[PDB]
Amino acid sequence: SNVAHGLAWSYYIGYLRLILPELQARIRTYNQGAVSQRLYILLPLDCGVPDNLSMADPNIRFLDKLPQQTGDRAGIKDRVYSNSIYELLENGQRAGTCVLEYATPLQTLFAMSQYSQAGFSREDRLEQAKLFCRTLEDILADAPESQNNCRLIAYQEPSFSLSQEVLRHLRQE
Amino acid sequence: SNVAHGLAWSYYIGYLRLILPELQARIRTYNQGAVSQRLYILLPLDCGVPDNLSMADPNIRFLDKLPQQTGDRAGIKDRVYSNSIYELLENGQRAGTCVLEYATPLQTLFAMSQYSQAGFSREDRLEQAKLFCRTLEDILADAPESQNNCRLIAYQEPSFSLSQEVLRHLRQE
Ligand SMILES: Nc1ncnc2c1ncn2[C@@H]1O[C@@H]2COP(=O)(O)O[C@@H]3[C@H](O)[C@@H](COP(=O)(O)O[C@H]2[C@H]1O)O[C@H]3n1ccc(=O)[nH]c1=O
């Protein structure tokens, strides 16, 4: 069970606590319809993470990239952190724009269930996705780096509309 | 104990199995002293991972970067994977040149031990570092992506010379 726990702490230490302090400055640079101030992280509990989000939903299209963030990390000179800006559609209309991406460790949970050596049952994929979201929420609720700049979007599919799911959180702000 | 196990599986799923198939073609492009054909991964058991490798050792200097590897990953368009080429010195002489980097999850192990919320004891970071190397070694031995293109350098330091440690693995090949 500690797998999803460590991945959530990994996700915060080696990513969120590094890019969240510099995000609002990157969004301001791109603006100068404006882009929302927060980073919206998609958390599909089925751990189904497509690499191309524009084709995953017709009402979600890639718009542009943010200016890249670079830094020396673990002996890698100028390791690049890049983020994408997406437009959310509603009845053929641009309803909102924001920085949108999936939580990558959910891909790791999915692949571990496929591998036999990983000791990770296929049935345990849902509860680890749940534990990943609970641990990540606990971290961000007490995170100094998280100051109204990060919004988690967790959902479960059984019709469901992903673009309508993101627009709900976007309008709440 | 399952924390380091999941970080090692993450390290292979979301990184090693993505860049190792492309590494030899990237090293050849740079060559056209030649650079070695394997990715050399430093595994300090004390989990002390500096971000600037050149500062850590006077006999290890940064030389150049490889051509960047990009790809759409989890909704992030053109996510960048970059690797650095280092030169290793011995008595004021260039003794070797290779692609060298630390295993970043060891930084995650170090940071979890300092956070109280992580449920990770200070004393347990050497134990988790040993499990991370053991799990990663088991994966790469059975990894089809790893075909004698990856070399792990685990070491425990109480004098110790890191550049001398890397050269030993280089000269075996
Ligand atoms: N540019 C980015 N775009 C979107 N997400 C990012 C980015 N950077 C970090 N993250 C998240 O942060 C997590 C932990 O990052 P990390 O601590 O660096 O350790 C990585 C992990 O243990 C394992 C799997 O990778 P994942 O991507 O699945 O997990 C990371 C992302 O979830 O391979 C490690 N690894 C990956 C690549 C690299 O270049 N060197 C490196 O060492």
SS (H, E, C) chain B: CHHHHHHHHHHHHHHHHHHHHHHHHHHHHHHCCCCCCCEEEEEECCCCCCCCHHHHCCCEEEEEECCCEEEEECCEEEEEECCEEEEEEECCEEEEEEEEEECCHHHHHHHHHHCHHHCCCCCHHHHHHHHHHHHHHHHHHCCCCCCCCEEEEEECCCCCCHHHHHHHHHHCC
A127 and A95, same structural domain?
A: yes
Contact A53, A87 (CB under 8 A): no
Per-residue buried b or exposed e for A81-106, using 16+ beta carbons within 10 Å of the residue's own CB: bbbbbbbbbeeeeebbbbbbbbbbbb
B71 and B30, same structural domain?
A: no
B84 and B54, same structural domain?
A: yes
Number of structural domains in chain A: 2
Sheet hosting strand A150-155, strand order edge to edge? A60-65, A84-90, A93-102, A39-44, A150-155
Count contacts between A and B (CB, < 8 Å).
142
Cα–Cα distance for residue pair A92/A163, rounded to 1 Å = 12
| Residue A49 burial (10 A CB sphere; 0-12, 13-18, 19+) | buried
B69 and B23, same structural domain?
A: no
Tell whether B131 is within 8 A of chain A (Cβ).
Answer: no
Cα–Cα distance for residue pair A3/B135, rounded to 1 Å = 13
User: Could you tell me if the CB of B70 is within 6 A of ligand 1?
Assistant: no
A57 and A89, same structural domain?
A: yes
| Residues sharing a CB contact under 8 Å with residue B84, sequence separation 6 or more, in sequence order | A75, A76, A77, B53, B62, B63, B64, B65, B66, B99, B100, B101
Domain range spanning residue A66? 36-173
A158 and A133, same structural domain?
A: yes
User: Could you tell me if the CB of A83 is within 6 A of ligand 1?
Assistant: no
- This structure's resolution (Å) is 2.6
Tell whether B2 is within 8 A of chain A (Cβ).
Answer: yes
A142 and A81, same structural domain?
A: yes
User: Could you tell me if the CB of B76 is within 6 A of ligand 1?
Assistant: yes
Q: Which residues of A are annotated as a binding site for 2',3'-cGAMP?
A: 10, 15, 79, 104
User: Using the beta-carbon criterion (under 8 Å), do B74 and A103 form an inter-chain contact?
Assistant: yes
A136 and A81, same structural domain?
A: yes
B48 and B17, same structural domain?
A: no
